[PDB]
Design an enzyme around this catalytic site. Structure first.
Site, PDB file in Angstrom:
ATOM      1  N   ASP A  60       0.813  -1.215   0.000  1.00 34.93           N
ATOM      2  CA  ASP A  60       0.000   0.000   0.000  1.00 34.93           C
ATOM      3  C   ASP A  60       0.862   1.288   0.000  1.00 34.93           C
ATOM      4  OD1 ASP A  60      -2.287  -1.598  -0.044  1.00 34.93           O
ATOM      5  OD2 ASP A  60      -2.950  -1.091   1.989  1.00 34.93           O
ATOM      6  N   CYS A  67      -0.340   2.285 -13.060  1.00 36.41           N
ATOM      7  CA  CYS A  67      -0.639   2.119 -11.639  1.00 36.41           C
ATOM      8  C   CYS A  67      -1.896   3.019 -11.358  1.00 36.41           C
ATOM      9  CB  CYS A  67       0.562   2.433 -10.729  1.00 36.41           C
ATOM     10  SG  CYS A  67       1.356   4.046 -11.010  1.00 36.41           S
ATOM     11  N   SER A  68      -1.828   3.947 -10.420  1.00 36.75           N
ATOM     12  CA  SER A  68      -2.930   4.862 -10.094  1.00 36.75           C
ATOM     13  C   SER A  68      -2.734   6.153 -10.913  1.00 36.75           C
ATOM     14  CB  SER A  68      -2.965   5.143  -8.587  1.00 36.75           C
ATOM     15  OG  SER A  68      -1.697   5.586  -8.124  1.00 36.75           O
ATOM     16  N   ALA A  69      -1.772   7.039 -10.517  1.00 31.08           N
ATOM     17  CA  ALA A  69      -1.468   8.283 -11.257  1.00 31.08           C
ATOM     18  C   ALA A  69      -0.569   8.005 -12.489  1.00 31.08           C
ATOM     19  CB  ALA A  69      -0.785   9.303 -10.329  1.00 31.08           C
ATOM     20  N   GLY A  70       0.120   6.860 -12.483  1.00 36.39           N
ATOM     21  CA  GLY A  70       0.988   6.404 -13.570  1.00 36.39           C
ATOM     22  C   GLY A  70       2.364   7.024 -13.655  1.00 36.39           C
ATOM     23  N   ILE A  71       2.942   7.387 -12.497  1.00 34.77           N
ATOM     24  CA  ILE A  71       4.270   8.033 -12.461  1.00 34.77           C
ATOM     25  C   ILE A  71       5.250   7.329 -11.476  1.00 34.77           C
ATOM     26  CG2 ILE A  71       3.469  10.296 -13.413  1.00 34.77           C
ATOM     27  CD1 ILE A  71       3.369  11.459 -10.360  1.00 34.77           C
ATOM     28  N   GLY A  72       4.752   6.821 -10.362  1.00 31.79           N
ATOM     29  CA  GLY A  72       5.587   6.207  -9.334  1.00 31.79           C
ATOM     30  C   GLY A  72       6.001   4.774  -9.521  1.00 31.79           C
ATOM     31  N   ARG A  73       5.071   3.860  -9.239  1.00 31.41           N
ATOM     32  CA  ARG A  73       5.317   2.409  -9.421  1.00 31.41           C
ATOM     33  C   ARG A  73       5.559   2.143 -10.927  1.00 31.41           C
ATOM     34  NH1 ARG A  73       0.172  -0.092  -6.001  1.00 31.41           N
ATOM     35  NH2 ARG A  73       0.520   1.049  -4.046  1.00 31.41           N
TER      36      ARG A  73
END
Ligand SMILES: Nc1nc2ccc(Sc3cccc(Cl)c3Cl)nc2[nH]1
Length: 477
Positions: free
Chosen positions: A377, A411-417
């Site tokens: 998470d 992923c969610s925002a598409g920048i981190g994971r």
């Protein structure tokens, strides 16, 4: 410039600096000392200093009483161009040279000469602390096709000079001035400050040694890279249009206009082409963006989708279900999808999807969805083994498919994971093509992907994960 970020400052020091050297509307950003991994936005308003928390668990910079941003430079630019009001008017500039690419601190004239001989070229330079003169500095430049010149930098009343002329309030100010106006030696030699000396490029075989050097290091190297983000403030106008506002998961996490995926048969999706095999880095689907997601996959000829989030995490919707149930057939606009078979593994689930355009028999193709489900998470996985094994399978699937389009990664925002997966995959693809005997540059590779989508790789935890992943991949070879 990004001078408003102070890397080695406490809250009390920040209050003191804003009160004695700032005015109303003055601000600075710094790392949070009371909770490492977080940041503090310290602002002066009507004679007093307030502290505003910025959190980042790996998806975005979440500002308390504000919005979610891809980078601190993007956050700062938004509030500068735009429970009462807090105004960001005047950046309080940092004079600390620690996060500068050219700053080396403790280094000798012999060692600087050795490093400038090995990796240097015409115009390569650095700034190091003086040996003979404690408290002074030395600018060491390489000139030719060759030689190395040492220029003494005097520190007199916390102002910097090279013996005459102007006195600078920081080493940065001195470096910038002598970069625009290069020093000329008596006999003609122009001491050009073309580029800082590279220190991050290592031979792949020796990753274990650098990981050991950084495990004593990771924080300083990452923050030097973060300082370079002010160069990537490219236009994101299409993402700001009224017609495209509700097509974005997070209002201010937008695709760069020059790399965005344009849809041709409207034209907008929050996705970017990543060129190192290429990728499409995108956000998790919204209810209203599922159709455009499938038009994107169909147009780009993508045959492989990597999903690195659960549909729901911490009771919040991270991606709507854009695929049918197993054996079911669904129509998403002009696009038609059949979920042929689902395969369950330890860390992930594979979904074999058949995609085609409605009314067009022949346009059918298989789209393989790799859904990683065990990413924590907050933070990164404890061990990279699972991520690497998932990525090896994804690579092999893509390799087996004749003229497959970019790999879609979200992923969610598409920048981190997403940013993290793409970078690991880029570095490993270098090692499989060249072997143990090849050069790898983790900050260079990240900077290159970050010029194609905002804040690709969000945290120091992710930065360290990329290093651990690469090291593990080289170890099991
Ligand atoms: N000493 C030192 N440590 C650093 C950590 C990160 C960076 S960023 C960087 C690295 C390589 C190429 C490119 Cl293009 C960039 Cl932007 N530079 C550094 N220099």
């Amino acid at each position: 410039s990004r001078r408003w970020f102070h890397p080695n400052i406490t809250g009390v020091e920040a209050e003191n600096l804003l009160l004695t050297r700032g005015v109303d509307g003055s601000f600075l950003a710094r790392p949070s000392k009371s909770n490492p991994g977080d940041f503090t936005l310290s602002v002066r308003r009507n004679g007093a200093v307030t502290h505003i928390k910025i959190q980042n668990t790996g998806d975005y910079y979440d500002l308390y009483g504000g919005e979610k941003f891809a980078t601190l430079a993007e956050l700062v630019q938004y509030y500068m161009e735009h429970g009462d009001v807090i105004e960001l008017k005047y950046p309080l500039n940092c004079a600390d040279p620690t996060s500068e690419r050219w700053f080396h601190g403790h280094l000798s004239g012999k060692e600087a000469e050795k490093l400038l001989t090995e990796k240097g070229k015409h115009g390569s330079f650095l700034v190091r602390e003086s040996q003979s003169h404690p408290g002074d500095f030395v600018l060491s430049v390489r000139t030719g096709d060759s030689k190395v010149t040492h220029v003494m930098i005097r520190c007199q009343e916390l102002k910097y000079d090279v013996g005459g002329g102007e006195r600078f309030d920081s080493l940065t100010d001195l470096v910038e001035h002598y970069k625009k106006n290069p020093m000329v030696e008596t006999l003609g030699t122009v001491l050009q400050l073309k580029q800082p000396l590279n220190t991050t490029r290592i031979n792949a075989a020796e990753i274990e040694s650098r990981v050991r050097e950084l495990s004593k290091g990771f924080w300083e190297e990452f923050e030097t890279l973060q300082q370079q983000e002010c160069k990537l403030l490219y236009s994101r106008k299409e993402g700001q249009r009224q017609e495209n506002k509700n097509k974005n998961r997070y209002k201010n996490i937008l695709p760069f206009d020059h790399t965005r995926v344009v849809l041709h048969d409207s034209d907008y999706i929050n996705a970017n082409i990543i060129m190192p095999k290429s990728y499409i880095a995108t956000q998790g689907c919204l209810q209203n963006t599922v159709n455009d997601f499938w038009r994107m996959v169909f147009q780009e000829n993508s045959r492989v989708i990597v999903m690195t989030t659960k549909e729901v995490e911490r009771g919040k919707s991270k991606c709507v279900k854009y695929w049918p149930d197993e054996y079911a057939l669904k129509e998403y606009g002009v696009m038609r999808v059949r979920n042929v078979k689902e395969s369950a593994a330890h860390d992930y689930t594979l979904r074999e999807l058949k995609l085609s355009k409605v009314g067009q028999g022949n346009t059918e193709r298989t789209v393989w969805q790799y859904h990683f489900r065990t990413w924590p998470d907050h933070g990164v996985p404890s061990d990279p083994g699972g991520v690497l094994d998932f990525l090896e399978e994804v690579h092999h699937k893509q390799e087996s498919i004749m003229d497959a389009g970019p790999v879609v990664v979200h992923c969610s925002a598409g920048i981190g994971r997403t940013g993290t997966f793409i970078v690991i995959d880029i570095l490993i693809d270098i090692i499989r093509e060249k072997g143990v005997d090849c050069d790898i540059d983790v900050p260079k590779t990240i900077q290159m992907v970050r010029s194609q989508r905002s804040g690709m790789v969000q945290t120091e935890a992710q930065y360290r994960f990329i290093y651990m992943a690469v090291q593990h991949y080289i170890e099991t070879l």
